Structure 1
Amino acid sequence: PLYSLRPEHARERLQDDSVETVTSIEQAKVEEKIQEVFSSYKFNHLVPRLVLQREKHFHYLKRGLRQLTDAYECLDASRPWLCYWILHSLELLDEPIPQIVATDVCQFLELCQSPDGGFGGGPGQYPHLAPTYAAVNALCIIGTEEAYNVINREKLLQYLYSLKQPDGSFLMHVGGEVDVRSAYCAASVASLTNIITPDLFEGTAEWIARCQNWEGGIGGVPGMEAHGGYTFCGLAALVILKKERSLNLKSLLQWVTSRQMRFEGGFQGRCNKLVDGCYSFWQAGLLPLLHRALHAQGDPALSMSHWMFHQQALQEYILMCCQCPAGGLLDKPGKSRDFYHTCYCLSGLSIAQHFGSGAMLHDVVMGVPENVLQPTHPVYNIGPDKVIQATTHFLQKPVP
């Protein structure tokens, strides 16, 4: 019954027009490998078994939360990301985190925090907004009085304020540049910690809104090509600020939906590019957001059981083509595993298997019923419970 294994699915293969270019050549090679992957069952005379290697993944994750090989030196300035990706993956798999590791993670994020606010990529590194978002996310996942407490709110707002630009944008860090990605980071920490003052995000929705181009998606900066990672950041940030309507939602829905690979089943980050497991979150994650936005406009034609993407086809991509047998997920077959791709492939899969839009709930889970993951919040990419818990907690505190 697998949608990607149906013989008809072959008619959904790169329809090159007998004119080759780097783009079609490349696309046809991924298409050929993915095909080998789908045909592996028939060629070997077995009935497909879509099973998510929980145990394997948990191994990788449990371990990495503690020690990494020198192969992660290129992430020496991204330690807090290491935490989020891993803690998030874990919560996604339902694996609990023992209070001592929680306290440990808690204490390291501490060493990562600047006395002037925000978090650095490592102990003693300067504060940047990405590690700031990752660290705050990481803490809200633990969600213990201890975690919450690490975050120094009066300085977090001081720091955010020193990044804010007049045009509505935000610096990724003192002396650095702006991009939609930073607006989201700041909206996110500012939201979860109840630090949003009345002028903090003034001009931000308008600035994010001008990064939407002719494609319908959002560029990293005004004038840039439509990009999934940025699009997610733009729409997400706008949902926090409650200004989604600032965008051309109609052209954005058309653009996301068109980023699904009719063959591979997963999502590319840019039109005319290649599939990539992580875009399972970045792009498919835009569907529940668009949904929430259109719903708030009393849109009556919305579905009440499914996202506006082939949940099935995407789940088959993650399950069949994105798991490394040693544990951990990946971009695509032939690529090495990494915690980033573990985090987002999982994040995406959870999104693809869970629908909810009020009281209307509806799962759809390919392969073995154990493949169900814990739901993920589409704005923050942390567990819905983790969001409610954190905001209730922080709301009980006065905005600096």
Structure 2
Amino acid sequence: LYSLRPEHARERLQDDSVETVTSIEQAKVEEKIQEVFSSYKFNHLVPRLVLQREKHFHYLKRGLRQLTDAYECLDASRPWLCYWILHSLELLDEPIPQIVATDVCQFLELCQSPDGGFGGGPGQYPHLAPTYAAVNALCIIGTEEAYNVINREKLLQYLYSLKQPDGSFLMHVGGEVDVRSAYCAASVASLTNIITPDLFEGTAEWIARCQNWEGGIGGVPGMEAHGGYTFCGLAALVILKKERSLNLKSLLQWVTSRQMRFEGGFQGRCNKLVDGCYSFWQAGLLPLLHRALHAQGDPALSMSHWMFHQQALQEYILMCCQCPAGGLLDKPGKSRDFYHTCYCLSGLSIAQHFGSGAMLHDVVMGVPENVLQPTHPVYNIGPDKVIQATTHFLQKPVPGF
């Protein structure tokens, strides 16, 4: 394993003897991770990376039905719980019962607002985060019924209701503004085919203002480059077919710098710590950046791998981010939840599967049963569900008015 090797131990943190609150914390994670790595040596077994797929399936399978009061804090993010669960199952190639899928469809219908969009639960004001989630969920199911839950004529109204003169959108009426709104709108509008000619007017330009001196993208112009926001920005531009509104060179140097030499996983910001959910928000930016670069006819691009260590990211996740009882997590010690479960898995899948036209170099770490179904680097739903959804809505006219 790349990680359990002896030279990899030189990838340890160089403190410069000038220790700050950052060195300290980084060094702390490194030791907890080293332990995991050396887990094998100390116990005298041969290393066998395996994805506790059944344990994870039973966790997910239960949460799709009910959660403890510990989830009272995500009581306004219910369509998200459907999406995270229904996507983890989707990647674990697990089943979505023709009855459960319906309930999900029926529940989301209760979340949907008469003004268009979706709320965090029955009766909540529509918000773009839950809307993005609900739409992705409905597409993962992908049936006349699910698709039919989505009110396209109302969704455009809503999208237009949040639209800002400078190109940005609010997340909800009277709500905040940051790149998530741009990606959320772009993802749902494109999939459901409601993109009019002036819907995203000036949106690519605002998103490009979020790109700062680091090569990365921030929440709003002027802010620090952040992985979750950079994924929102890049993916939003890919949708709008305007990746080029950015300096892709520096964005590439920035994202690639986010992978932790010693841990293998990614960090959300320069000088922060590794975190399993970033296995998708940050690593997902390379496939996006492959297309982009190859699109402008780039020759130096690989035909088998992404511009990040696919091996190291799979070791990090498999070894360090898996919960014995099921579910995945931030890093060792952290508690398990459906968000990290959905994103550690999405990242594993990104790391295991490459593409480049007709090239297909999958890399599956450990037990070959560890390979996951594929996921689309823009929507983060199975590439087949994406294709199936867009075309189905494509036979509907854009709500012209």
TM above 0.5, one fold?
Answer: yes
| SS of equivalent residue, structure 2 residue 354 | strand
Kindly state the Cα deviation for residue 94 of structure 1 after the two structures are TM-superposed. Answer: 0.2
The separation in 2 between residues aligned to 1:202 and 1:301, in whole angstroms, is: 34
Matched, 1:365 2:380: no
Structure 2 counterpart SS, 1:230: helix
TM superposition shift of 1:120:
0.1
Query: 1: distance between equivalents of 2:374 and 2:356?
Result: 13
CA distance in 1, matches of 2:7, 2:26: 19
- In the TM superposition, structure 1's runs of 4+ consecutive aligned residues that sit over 6 Å from their partners are none
1:177 is displaced (CA, Å) by: 1.6
1:372 and 1:63 mapped to 2: Cα distance? 23
- Cα deviation for residue 160 of structure 1 reads 0.1
SS of structure 2 residue aligned to 1:209:
helix
**SS of aligned partner of 2:113:** coil
Q: Does the residue aligned with 1:99 lie in a helix, a strand or coil?
A: coil
Q: Secondary structure at the match of 1:154?
A: helix
Deviation at 1:208, TM superposition (A): 0.2
Aligned-residue offset at 1:35: 0.1
Gaps of 5+ in 2: none
Q: Distance in 1 between matches of 2:243 and 2:391?
A: 24
> Deviation per CA, 1:311-367, whole angstroms, max 9, x where unpaired?
000000000000000000000000000000000000000000000011011101111
Q: TM-score, normalised by structure 2?
A: 0.99
Distance of 2:70 and 2:277 partners within structure 1: 20
Shift of residue 90 of structure 1? 0.5
In structure 2, what is the Cα distance between the partners aligned to 1:181 and 1:122? 20
Distance 1:34 1:330 in 2: 13
Measure, in 2, the Cα distance between the counterparts of 1:28 and 1:170: 40
Q: Secondary structure at the match of 2:361?
A: strand
Identity %: 100
Deviations 1:156-198 (A, max 9, x none): 0000001001110000001112111110000000000000000
- Shift, 1:152, TM fit: 0.2
Once the two structures are TM-superposed, the CA of residue 19 in structure 1 deviates from its matched residue by 1.0
Q: Deviations over 1:204-263 (max 9, x none)?
A: 000000000000000000110000000000000000000000000000000000000000
* Distance in 1, Cα, partners of 2:150 & 2:204: 26
How far has the Cα of 1:96 moved from its partner? 1.4
- Residue 277 of structure 1 is matched in structure 2 by 276
Q: What is the CA–CA distance in structure 2 between the aligned matches of 1:305 and 1:157, rounded to whole Å?
A: 40
Q: Runs of 5+ in structure 1 lacking a partner? A: none
CA distance, structure 2, for counterparts of residue 96 and residue 390 of structure 1: 19
User: How far apart in 2 are the matches of 1:95 and 1:165?
Assistant: 41
2:162 counterpart SS class: coil
Alpha-carbon distance in 2 for matches of 1:163, 1:254:
33
Matched, 1:119 2:107: no
Distance 2:373 2:16 in 1: 43
Number of aligned residue pairs: give it.
399
Shift of 1:199: 0.2
> What is the Cα deviation at residue 45 of structure 1?
0.6
* Residues 18-60 of structure 1, C-alpha deviations (whole Å, 9 max, x = no match): 1111000000000000000000100101111100000000000
Please state whether the residue corresponding to 1:200 is helix, strand or coil.
coil
In structure 2, C-alpha distance between the alignment counterparts of 1:95 and 1:346, rounded to whole Å: 13
- Alpha-carbon distance between aligned partners in 2 of 1:317 and 1:294, rounded to the nearest angstrom: 28
Take 2:164 and 2:366, find their aligned partners in 1: how far apart are those partners? 48
Tell me the distance in 2 between the aligned counterparts of 1:120 and 1:212: 30
d(CA) in 2 for partners of 1:108 and 1:66? Answer: 12
